[PDB]
Amino acid sequence: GHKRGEQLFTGVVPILVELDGDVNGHRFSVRGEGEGDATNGRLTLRFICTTGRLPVPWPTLVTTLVQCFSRYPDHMRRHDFFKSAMPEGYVQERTISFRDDGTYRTRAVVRFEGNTLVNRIELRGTNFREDGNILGHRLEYNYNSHNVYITADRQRNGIRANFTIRHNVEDGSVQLANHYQQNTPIGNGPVLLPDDHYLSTQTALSRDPNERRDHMVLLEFVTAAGIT
Numbered sequence: 001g002h003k004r005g006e007q008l009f010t011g012v013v014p015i016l017v018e019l020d021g022d023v024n025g026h027r028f029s030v031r032g033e034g035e036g037d038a039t040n041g042r043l044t045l046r047f048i049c050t051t052g053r054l055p056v057p058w059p060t061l062v063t064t065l066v067q068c069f070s071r072y073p074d075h076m077r078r079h080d081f082f083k084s085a086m087p088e089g090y091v092q093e094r095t096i097s098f099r100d101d102g103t104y105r106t107r108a109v110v111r112f113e114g115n116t117l118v119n120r121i122e123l124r125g126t127n128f129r130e131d132g133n134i135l136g137h138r139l140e141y142n143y144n145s146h147n148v149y150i151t152a153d154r155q156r157n158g159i160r161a162n163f164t165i166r167h168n169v170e171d172g173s174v175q176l177a178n179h180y181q182q183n184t185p186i187g188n189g190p191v192l193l194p195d196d197h198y199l200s201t202q203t204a205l206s207r208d209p210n211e212r213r214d215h216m217v218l219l220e221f222v223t224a225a226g227i228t
């Protein structure tokens with residue numbers, strides 16, 4: 001499926017993101033729109049909290065809110081699980097453990113709906129501290145560059161990822177977010193299971209000066225590496 005998979009991402013692909021969340025019993029929705037250019041490893045997305053103010057800091061939702069847009073170098077083309085699963089797509093599930101705070105559990109369907117790459121997500125957040133860095137909104141509106149360490153999950157016919165997000169705190173401390181990820185294909189066709197490698201992920205967060213709703217403008221650059 002990797003040959004057809006590759007061809008689905010050769011140009012600029014429209015993206016739709018839909019997130020329904022419940023954190024410590026606070027319900028919210030995020031809707032995101034933009035485009036991906038896998039050839040350049042580039043994402044541009046605009047996200048709206050459609051339900052009011054986001055009950056958690058925007059930066060905490062970045063990993064949850066489409067790794068099929070990663071730039072896989074030619075010599076790593078056999079290691080691109082994400083594109084090989086398209087168009088039928090994959091289920092992406094995470095546990096995100098915030099050090100000394102609560103936990104997100106996420107389940108996402110990533111697939112083509114017509115010519116649009118859609119990321120449809122459910123998030124449940126539990127056991128957050130009422131006056132922690134997250135519910136207290138003490139995280140800076142910024143984002144560090146990270147390596148996502150990918151390994152094959154042969155039993156699942158998919159992949160696992162492990163990484164720790166470093167969120168800058170307003171007092172100059174760092175809030176760690178331990179990510180446990182598994183991806184499983186939705187389709188029955190063959191997918192590529194990779195040798196161990198990483199995704200070099202860089203994220204720029206900005207604001208739309210014209211937008212009244214709680215929102216996040218995102219630009220992301222992602223390249224696969226760690227295989228010679």
Ligand SMILES: [Cu+2]
Pocket residue numbers: 001002003004084190191192
């Ligand atoms: Cu294939």
